[PDB]
Amino acid sequence: LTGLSDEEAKEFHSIFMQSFLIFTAVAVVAHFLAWAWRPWIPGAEGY
């Protein structure tokens, strides 16, 4: 067991999930821009 208490662990988790959410939100926009540039899922006939 690490030194962090339940309050400390809960506060870290809340900030971690928010920080992870913002990181994923930026990447989602980056993928929307990438898709608008060149999509990466080909159809049955390819590209």
Binding site: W40, I41, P42, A44, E45, G46, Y47
Partner: protein
């Protein structure tokens, strides 16, 4: 089957699972890339 963690160390199992699944996930994605029909970046006809 929660008794598994009285035998296997949960802290080490979780770390090994992530590393192991990292290798496997890269391995499978790489296998698909090598194929003609499932290289999504190449986009060959199906």
């Amino acid at each position: 089957m929660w008794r598994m963690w009285k035998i296997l160390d949960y802290r080490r199992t979780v770390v090994l699972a992530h590393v192991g699944m990292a290798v496997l996930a890269l391995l499978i994605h790489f296998i698909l890339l090598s194929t003609e029909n499932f290289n999504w970046l190449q986009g060959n006809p199906y």
